[PDB]
Design a protein around this ligand. Structure first.
Ligand SMILES: *[C@@H]1O[C@H](CO)[C@@H](O)[C@H](O)[C@H]1NC(C)=O
Ligand SMILES: *[C@@H]1O[C@H](CO)[C@@H](O)[C@H](O)[C@H]1NC(C)=O
Ligand SMILES: *[C@@H]1O[C@H](CO)[C@@H](O)[C@H](O)[C@H]1NC(C)=O
Ligand SMILES: OC[C@H]1O[C@H](O)[C@@H](O)[C@@H](O)[C@@H]1O
Ligand SMILES: *[C@H]1O[C@H](CO)[C@@H](O)[C@H](O)[C@@H]1O
Ligand SMILES: *[C@H]1O[C@H](CO)[C@@H](O)[C@H](O)[C@@H]1O
Ligand SMILES: *[C@H]1O[C@H](CO)[C@@H](O)[C@H](O)[C@@H]1O
Ligand SMILES: *[C@H]1O[C@H](CO)[C@@H](O)[C@H](O)[C@@H]1O
Ligand SMILES: [Cu+2]
Length: 230
């Protein structure tokens, strides 16, 4: 359980959607993070992989703000304290809004995988994962905006999938978090994305998986990493 509470881009800081506070305010601030009803700080499970909740988490609505970032620059996402038990991959996607992201129809976002890390080392079961690297780096993850991606208004969908109960059908726990970015630069690529409701299935090898054994490989779920990615 947890959420993205802060975002840093080239020395400027942007509050996340503080789901522990904003849902209970009459006038919460405008932020680049999407609002969600995931008030218990929980997850989306595989029974919702074809439903709108998997896109940007439960009942999510776009943030009213966007953060500028140069193509080729970095975006740092700062999570709340992530529990070590929640081992799994850390996956990040960009989707062009082709318009103002704050009024986008989230079912029309086609997500391009631009960053993904999975099982790092399994010499001691259940292994060291991207989520453990995230914990060690001050509970944060940094992604690079591909330098060739065309400028525009994009959603960054940043996600931890916790696998500690994924040995059972519908056991995986997806924690997606969306923020709005205004990407600048001289990129010209418009890679093909995947609709959020088509990213994952409940039987994917990285989704239905028993991490309490030595794994020789872990297939990170979702579409292929885009060749333009860092
Ligand atoms: C989430 O959206 C559904 C579908 O419109 C709605 O029925 C439900 O009440 C919402 N849940 C909230 C706002 O907590
Ligand atoms: C994008 O839409 C939001 C929500 O209506 C609005 O507040 C904001 O001003 C818009 N951004 C621009 C650059 O027009
Ligand atoms: C570590 O994370 C906290 C909150 O998650 C943040 O306030 C702090 O600036 C971060 N430190 C660095 C060096 O990024
Ligand atoms: O449009 C998708 C396409 O965009 C990139 O710029 C190319 O390098 C290809 O490797 C990739 O498949
Ligand atoms: C490691 O070993 C497993 C069998 O457990 C294979 O499925 C995998 O391809 C790799 O060789
Ligand atoms: C667990 O054992 C497997 C072989 O099945 C190795 O691939 C892995 O590195 C770990 O030693
Ligand atoms: C082991 O093999 C799988 C493919 O079966 C890869 O996806 C993984 O990254 C590792 O190389
Ligand atoms: C990942 O890579 C494959 C080809 O390697 C593409 O077909 C796909 O669209 C994604 O960019
Ligand atoms: Cu949890």
């Amino acid at each position: 359980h947890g959420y993205v509470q802060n975002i840093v881009i080239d020395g400027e800081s942007y509050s996340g959607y503080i789901v522990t506070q904003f849902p209970y305010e009459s006038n919460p601030p405008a932020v680049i993070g999407w609002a969600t009803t995931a008030t218990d700080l929980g997850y989306v499970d595989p029974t919702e992989y074809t439903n709108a909740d998997i896109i940007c988490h439960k009942n999510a609505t776009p943030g009213a703000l966007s953060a500028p970032v140069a193509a080729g620059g970095t975006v740092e996402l700062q999570w709340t304290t992530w529990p070590d038990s929640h081992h799994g991959p850390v996956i990040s996607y960009l989707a062009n809004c082709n318009g103002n992201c704050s009024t986008v129809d989230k079912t029309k976002l086609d997500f391009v995988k631009i960053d993904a890390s999975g099982l790092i080392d399994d010499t001691t079961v259940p292994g060291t994962w991207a989520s453990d690297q995230l914990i060690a780096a001050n509970n944060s993850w940094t992604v690079t905006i591909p330098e060739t991606i065309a400028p525009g208004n994009y959603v960054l969908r940043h996600e931890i999938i916790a696998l500690h109960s994924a040995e059972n059908t519908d056991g995986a726990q997806n924690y997606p978090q969306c923020i709005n970015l205004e990407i600048t630069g001289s990129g010209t690529a418009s890679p093909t994305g995947t609709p959020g409701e088509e990213l994952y299935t409940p039987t994917d090898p990285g989704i239905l998986v028993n991490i309490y054994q030595s794994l020789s490989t872990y297939v990170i779920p979702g579409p292929t990493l885009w060749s333009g990615a860092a």
